[PDB]
């Protein structure tokens, strides 16, 4: 009956929950890999404490990332059956290739990185985290090309004698114009998220440690200042990359999807009505407009939340010029306020992208065959409202409780700080064939 | 010859790997509570024993559960009609299975972050729920799939209460699957531990031997008499012989490797029998034996099947190789007096 609005709400809620945690993982895996490589190279135990202190947080995030992602795999067939019959022939290949080529790698090798701190040689233990860091980007590429088929589809035929998409070329699907730009933009966003996270955490701990004095006043200059500088440089280069990839992706959006563009730069001639008449003459009657309010303000918020990390990075790179250490109270508050803004910008961008193509679930390609198209009213499953209210309420409640617990754990472990006093030298890793009293990790 | 039949076989192999590698996961999850409870009856504290039980599937459980994800993805890629119909028909079962899996995933990995005794009770409850629920619901789902569903004309399986939980042949499937997974996990823990949790695992397996035997025997006979071809007699005989061998080996108390090979054979034989009692079609229809999906009106297309065949025949052997290697690496043995002291933060659960 009214299962359409409930299904849309459910899918949106769940994907936003998932992408709250995705970018931190994608951006923090390579940073931890670099922090471990610079320790294995130089031998300075300062980066060992940093890589452990951030590995704990990385794992706390990875658990809930996997848990939130697990449902998206089945939601397609559960709530969107008629859509899955239309695009299954094509949509199923990137998903299965992702499952076979990235999920297996990351899942198998993070378990080796967690438990092999004193069982594997050091070079193998470093290769483990490098493999994890590459796999968490391969999976992003696969899934983003999958989504980029839904808007500007390329390699399909639409066999009429069966009513299906029917894939015809995999090379044309994996080298899509939209897919490359979307992948680059999303990777830049994830790296911005992780860089801001590291820089703000280390800036807070640098302002806090300098005031304590005693013995910890020497951890600042040796450990918290270099990490802050690294984070700020990563943030700046990610901001420039975001600007350029976004300009490219906007140039793309102008030509292959004009309704989204006309809805982004709205007043607050008209475009949205001439395109309405054009689409009504092309594809019969119907209403072909997005919300015009969410689409107007998500673009603005996504672009405007970039001024906070940029200003923070530019101020932190100047407050620590030669070798000095900042002690201003307002700097720590600024570092604390700068943390949620990358998450907010990522969510705003993904909400603009998704709710902009809104009457469609497979957008008609202006230079395609015009038969590969599907509004989001012929894609939803035929269920009752009482069956969808159950899933919506259950998922919303479970994910809300898990997110509150996740925030509590991250705040606790950030306030605790790096357990430098709690036995953090480089582990000796003695050879095997010995009943060592601990195992170095046991869940 | 027959890319469609080849991909039927490949989907069967993915589900077989999932069942084989999650059997002892679900068994350990079901049994860790009793492992802890058997230590208090000796006077010792139960926390090292519960940690030693959970630690046998420490580094491998995530890679184990990826098999279900890749099996669902392979269904969506090769047989999208079966994917759509099956997952929109079994809506409540999938909803419950997913709500349990979420809790298990998050509890296993957040259990040891805080040192409060009340924080560990909810983690243990989450592990228990996420191990008990799928172990029954997957057997129920596959038994109902082999028995048949009400596919109306093209799609839209709408079943209420007697097509999903038909007492005959469907709850028996869930009971048999739960008992078999418990036995599998008991004899798996009996092989990765070193001296006093090993004897507890042997006791649990000696208690579980006969019920699992009787349940899987009854389920196999019922399946092969109601829905069965001529070459599945061999699979049923193999499963029965393997279960007898495993029982005889467990009641001795010294083999522990043959007793695991035998239970692996039993699980594989159950899966192979369910799929071979179904091969020609997918989701038979109880309304009309013409409205039922098959591999002939449910597959994708020649090109997609060829591309997926290349991808699978390139990536699956490598996955098997390096997962066998990671099982070899962490396979020394685990004692109860070898678990590190709990190192977690202070207090104030949530
Ligand atoms: C930018 C790339 C990207 C995007 C847009 C998505 N994911 Fe995701 N997903 C990831 C990339 C990723 C990840 C960030 O790499 C995760 C998070 C934590 C992790 O370890 O992997 C992950 C975890 C993850 C898992 C856990 C599997 C495992 O145990 O390794 C599954 C099944 C999915 N995702 C599926 C999906 C589906 C069906 C999505 C569509 C809405 C989706 N993800 C959004
Ligand atoms: C966060 C954010 C986000 C993300 C990440 C996403 C990711 C995605 N996505 Fe999106 N979506 C969205 C945001 C999103 N999304 C939303 C919000 C929704 C709901 C709403 C509407 O649509 O209206 C969606 C919904 C959706 C759907 C259903 C239909 C409609 O339209 O409704 C689909 C199919 C999709 C596809 C997708 C894919 C495949 C992916 C992976 C790549 N999506
Ligand atoms: C954080 C990070 C970030 C930031 C800062 C942003 C800010 C921005 N951005 Fe954003 N975005 C994003 C991340 C972002 N973003 C994302 C992730 C998204 C969604 C996804 C895709 O790509 O699709 C977006 C969405 C988006 C899009 C899409 C559209 C379509 O659909 O096609 C574009 C073009 C953009 C550009 C941009 C620019 C130019 C800027 C300024 C510089 N973006």
Numbering used by the authors:
A (entry chain A): 1 to 268, 313 to 487
B (entry chain B): 1 to 350
Text taken from the publication that reported this structure:
Cytochromes bd are ubiquitous amongst prokaryotes including many human-pathogenic bacteria. Since cytochrome bd is a key enzyme for the survival of prokaryotes and is absent in mammals, it is a promising therapeutic target for the development of antibacterial agents. This bd oxidase consists of two subunits CydA and CydB, that adopt a pseudo two-fold symmetrical arrangement.
In the present study, we have determined a 2.8 Å cryo-electron microscopy (cryo-EM) structure of a dimeric bd oxidase from Mycobacterium smegmatis (Msm). The three heme groups (b558, b595, and d) unambiguously identified in Msm bd oxidase are organized in a triangulated arrangement near the periplasmic side of CydA. In the present study, the densities corresponding to the Q-loop without and with aurachin D (a quinone analog inhibiting mycobacterial cytochrome bd) bound are not completely resolved. Intriguingly, there is an additional accessible channel directly connecting to the protein surface and extending to the heme b595, which is also identified in the G. th enzyme.
